[PDB]
Each structure stands twice: as C-alpha cells, then as structure tokens.
Amino acid sequence: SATTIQKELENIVVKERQNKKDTILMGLKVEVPWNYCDWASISFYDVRLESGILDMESIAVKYMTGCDIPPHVTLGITNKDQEANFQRFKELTRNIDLTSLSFTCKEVICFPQSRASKELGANGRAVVMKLEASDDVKALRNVLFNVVPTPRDIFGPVLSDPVWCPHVTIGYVRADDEDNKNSFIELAEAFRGSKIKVIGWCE
Ligand SMILES: Nc1ncnc2c1ncn2[C@@H]1O[C@@H](CO)[C@@H](OP(=O)(O)S)[C@H]1O
Ligand SMILES: Nc1nc2[nH]cnc2c(=O)[nH]1
C-alpha cells in the first residue's frame, strides 16, 4: 500500500509530465505491416479534434492524435537541453547499422489511461503492439541512458522499478467505448508475430 509520501510523490510525477513541453524524442523509426485502411471501421481519439483540452502543448496529450502516428519505437524522452548529448550519441553510434535491428510483434496492449492526460481533459487510451526487443536494442537503450541523461520512467507506482515495454503505438481510442476498443484490438491482433524493421533514428 502506498504511503502518504508516495502518494504525494505520484502527484509530483503526474504534474511533472503535464508541465513537460519541448522535450526531444530518442526513438527508432520503423516500418509496420498495417495501414490506416486496416482500421477503417475503428473510431479514433484525436485531441486536435477535441474540446476541453486544458493544455495542448503538454507532451501528455500533444501526441494523442488518433491513428495519425509515425511508426516508431521510443527508446526515451528527455529535455531539450540534452539535444547536444543525444547528437553526440548518434555520432558515437555511427558505425552501428540500425537497419539490422528488428522487433517481433508479440501482443496487442491497450495501455491504461495516463492520469496526466486525463487531468488535462483527455479521454483516450493508447492501443499498442508490444514488441520483443533483441539484446542489441536493449543494450543500445541502456548505453543511450548512460551518455544522454534521461528522466527515469515512472509509469506505475513511484516505488516500482520500471519494466521497459518496447512497443509501436497504433492509435488512440476513447476510454469509454469498449466495443470500439475490443474491435480495434481484435483487428490489430492479426499482425501478431510480424517482424518490424528499423529504418533509423526518429528525426
Ligand atoms: N518530442 C516528443 N516528446 C515527447 N514525446 C514525443 C515526442 N515526439 C513524439 N513523441 C511521442 O510522444 C510519446 C508520448 O509521450 C511517445 O509516444 P509512444 O511511443 O507512441 S507511447 C513518444 O514517442
Ligand atoms: N514502457 C511502458 N510504457 C507504459 N505506458 C503505460 N504503462 C507503461 C509501462 O508499464 N511501460
């Protein structure tokens, strides 16, 4: 059970996310086997079409744009002042062939609604394809965090240790329409077992 301090620390984590703007994405641009038309029967949640969003610039809702998402696997998100360190890391890894890296689609997961987005007026949940990452990807991410200071992930209770869930987000849907959510998951489940190829760094 969480303590008083832990509960207070969670509020700080959520607010920190809400306050975050202008961060940089350290991720791998990938090619996926699914297309928009595969989800033609699905209704997506796009904050750009919604009202009551209290801060469109917050990274907690800014990227909740239906299925209009560039296919990518996030390694980490950090502050803009780390841009130089990240650029230096890309140069340090210039000899690494990122296109040799591969992920395997395992299971379709609908992440829980982030409290940071909900408090900013969002009503969406992310449907993602959980990926199996090779040791090369895991090592690449660890060394990235060694060269480029990156906020520690805290997706759960503040006391828990983060378990990286490599994933390619497919689309956001309303958190209050189960039929739509389940139909989406079913359709996305058809792509399980597919292999995703890395093209390079997200730019
Ligand atoms: N400059 C940026 N700063 C923070 N996030 C950014 C971003 N550009 C893209 N995103 C995407 O927004 C994330 C949600 O925070 C992730 O999406 P995801 O992997 O699909 S759950 C992330 O990739
Ligand atoms: N990597 C990762 N992202 C998440 N987003 C929401 N929950 C999680 C989680 O457990 N892991």
Give me the number of domains the chain comprises: 1
Phi, psi of 27 (to 5 degrees): -150, 175
Find, among 171, 191, 193, the residue nearest to 41 by Cα.
Answer: 171
The span from the CA of 79 to the CA of 170, in Å, is 25
Phi, psi values for residue 17, rounded to 5°: -60, -45
Say if ligand 1 is within 6 A of residue 77 CB.
yes
Classify residue 59 as left (phi > 0), alpha (psi -120 to 50) or beta. alpha
Q: How many A from CA of 154 to the centre of ligand 2? A: 8
Which of 103, 153, 160, 164 maximizes ligand 2 atoms within 8 Å of its Cβ, making it the mutation to test the pocket?
153
**Is residue 34 within 8 Å of residue 188, measured between CB atoms?**
yes
Residue located nearest, by CA, to atom 8 of ligand 2: 155
Q: Which domain holds residue 118?
A: 4-201
- Dihedral sign for Cα 17, 161, 123, 196, please: positive
Looking at all shown ligands, the one closest to residue 155's CA atom is 2
- The token duo for 84 is 């130089």
Contact indicator for 117, 61 with CB cutoff of 8 Å? yes
What's the rounded Cα separation, in Å, for the pair 123 and 181? 13
86 is in an annotated binding site: no
Measured distance CA(164)–CA(76) in Å, rounded: 10
3-state secondary structure 77-130: EEEHHHHHHHHHHHHHCCCCCHHHCEEEEEEEEECCCCHHHHHCCCCEEEEEEE
Cα–chain center distance at 194: 19
Q: Cα–Cα distance between 9 and 165 in angstroms, integer?
A: 23
Q: Using an 8 Å Cβ cutoff, are 152 and 16 in contact?
A: no
Nearest CA residue ID for atom 4, ligand 2: 155
Q: Quick check: 6 and 60 in contact, CB under 8 A?
A: no
Q: Any idea what DSSP says for residue 33?
A: S
Q: Please list, residue by residue across 178-196, b when 16 or more beta carbons sit within 10 angstroms of its beta carbon and e when fewer do.
A: eebbebbbebbeebeeeeb
Adjacent-strand bridge partners of 133: 103
Q: 3-class DSSP state for residue 43?
A: coil
Euclidean distance between the first and the last CA atom of the chain, given in angstroms as a whole number:
41
Q: Is 111 annotated as a binding residue?
A: yes
Nearest-angstrom CA–CA distance, 86 and 143: 11
Buried b (16+ CB within 10 A) or exposed e, 146-160: eebebbeebeeebee
**Total length of the chain:** 203
Q: What is the CB-side half-sphere exposure of residue 106 using CA atoms within 13 A?
A: 11
Helix or strand holding residue 158 (H, E): none
Distance 96 CA to ligand 2 centre (A): 27
Resolution in A, one decimal? Answer: 2.1
Q: Report the alpha-carbon distance of residue 203 to residue 90 in Å, rounded.
A: 12
The answer to whether 203 and 107 are in contact (CB under 8 A) is: no
Domain holding 157: CATH number? Answer: 3.90.1140
Q: Is 145 in the pocket of ligand 2 (CB under 6 A)?
A: no
For the CA of 114, the closest atom of ligand 2 is 6
Q: How far is the CA of 163 from the centre of ligand 2 (A)?
A: 8
Q: 98: burial class by Cβ within 10 Å (0-12, 13-18, 19+)?
A: middle
